[PDB]
Amino acid sequence: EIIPRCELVKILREHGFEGFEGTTIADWICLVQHESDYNTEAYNNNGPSRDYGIFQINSKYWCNDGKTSGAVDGCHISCSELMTNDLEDDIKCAKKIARDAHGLTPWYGWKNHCEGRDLSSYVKGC
Ligand SMILES: [Cl-]
Ligand SMILES: [Cl-]
Ligand SMILES: [Cl-]
Ligand SMILES: [Cl-]
């Protein structure tokens, strides 16, 4: 399903995302827009790894999909748990990734389309 922008804003605010590892709500909204386009079932199969769900979490380092060579399962979850309408597993796993990296550099979509920009538009009007 698609999680509307302002719904996602409220979900992340009510989960303590503002200030989390120095990040902002706008950072995460812009991240989602450029990674999954707000789709809980977003999916990219790059070949050596697959990315799952609203935060495009990676089967090489963070979730087990049973079909990625050279993998570790840093979030100790099946990737299929990141393809559901329930964002709890996504939130827990994304927080662990961002805590590991002390920020959002794991997400190229955020580096390329968000970092160092005016992100007002992502968080206004809710
Ligand atoms: Cl909730
Ligand atoms: Cl807040
Ligand atoms: Cl960051
Ligand atoms: Cl708001």
Residue numbers in the entry: 1 to 126
What do the study's own words say?
Lysins (amidases, lysozymes/muramidases and peptidases) are such specialised bio-molecules. The term lysozyme, or muramidase, is broadly used to describe the enzymes that cleave the β-1,4-glycosidic bond between N-acetylglucosamine (NAG) and N-acetylmuramic acid (NAM) (or vice versa) in the carbohydrate backbone of peptidoglycan, Figure 1. Earlier reports had indicated the extraordinary stability of the digestive lysozyme from Opisthocomus hoazin at low pH, and the corresponding cDNA sequence (Genbank entry AAA73935.1) had been published. In addition, we have determined the crystal structure of the apo enzyme and of complexes with reaction products (chito-oligosaccharides). The structure presented here is the first to be determined for the avian upper-gut subset of GH22 lysozymes, and is, as expected, very similar overall to other C-type lysozymes.
As expected, OhLys has a typical GH22 lysozyme fold. The chain was traced from Glu1 through to Cys126, with a glycerol from the cryoprotectant, four Cl− ions and 200 water molecules. There are four disulphide bridges (Cys6–Cys126, Cys30–Cys114, Cys63–Cys79 and Cys75–Cys93) in the structure. The overall charge of OhLys differs somewhat from that of other C-type lysozymes. This increase in negative charge of OhLys is evident in the surface electrostatics of the enzyme. While the significance of this is not clear, it should be noted that the peptidoglycan substrate is also a charged molecule, and that peptidoglycan from different bacterial sources have different pI. So, charge interactions between the enzyme and the substrate at working pH are probably functionally important.
